[PDB]
Amino acid sequence: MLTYGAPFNFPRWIDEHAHLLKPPVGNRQVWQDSDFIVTVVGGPNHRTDYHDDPLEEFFYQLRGNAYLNLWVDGRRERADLKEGDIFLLPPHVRHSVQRPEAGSACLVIERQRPAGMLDGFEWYCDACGHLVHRVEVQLKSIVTDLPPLFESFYASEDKRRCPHCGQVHPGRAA
Ligand SMILES: [Fe+2]
Ligand SMILES: [Fe+2]
């Protein structure tokens, strides 16, 4: 009843999964069907969507650097995950994680969401900073519940059009 296997060396597990910690794939979840979702995230990867997590997110940047674009107190903000940094993100703080560096590796820990506890994914207008669009999801598996969400935002000018100025968000790349 060691459901998740025995202890294993983390530095070598990362090395052996280097090929998955780059595009297209970029991340890799360590254990399946656990309440703690433990993930190593590589790079490079940039993104425009902001995440509204209904629970906390723990970060430990083992290798290389990254940063988070944030909305805090109503203003845009960057928080830097220099190598060796740890960070706890409180629920519902909008965050957009940028990972410019190949060969980087960040341990990210989250919890399964209970039924009815929803995640949100939002884009904002580069022009007027207004909320451009938001999907809420019952997040079960990032691999099938998230890609289609981004794809459908990039494909629809109607979803990218700011409802306050009319600027059509550029979609995938800022
Ligand atoms: Fe997140
Ligand atoms: Fe706008």
Swiss-Prot record:
Binding-site residues, substrate: 57, 99, 110
EC numbers, comma separated: 1.13.11.6
Outcome, altering residue 47 to A: Increases KM for 3-hydroxyanthranilate 7-fold. Decreases activity 1000-fold
Pathway per the UniProt entry: Cofactor biosynthesis; NAD(+) biosynthesis; quinolinate from L-kynurenine: step 3/3
The UniProt record lists the keyword Amino-acid biosynthesis: no
A GO MF label: 3-hydroxyanthranilate 3,4-dioxygenase activity
Pfam families associated with the record: 3-HAO
Cofactor notes: Binds 2 Fe(2+) ions per subunit.
Binding residues for O2: 47
Family annotation (SUPFAM superfamilies): RmlC-like cupins (SSF51182)
Residues that coordinate or bind Fe cation 1: 51, 57, 95
Domain of life from the UniProt record: Bacteria
Catalysed reaction equations from the record: 3-hydroxyanthranilate + O2 = (2Z,4Z)-2-amino-3-carboxymuconate 6-semialdehyde
Known cofactor(s): Fe(2+)
GO biological process, alphabetically ordered: anthranilate metabolic process; L-tryptophan catabolic process; NAD biosynthetic process; quinolinate biosynthetic process
Family from the record: Belongs to the 3-HAO family.
Function: Catalyzes the oxidative ring opening of 3-hydroxyanthranilate to 2-amino-3-carboxymuconate semialdehyde, which spontaneously cyclizes to quinolinate.
The name this protein goes by in its record: 3-hydroxyanthranilate 3,4-dioxygenase
Organism: Cupriavidus metallidurans (strain ATCC 43123 / DSM 2839 / NBRC 102507 / CH34) (Ralstonia metallidurans)
Lineage, uppermost ranks: Bacteria, Pseudomonadati, Pseudomonadota, Betaproteobacteria, Burkholderiales
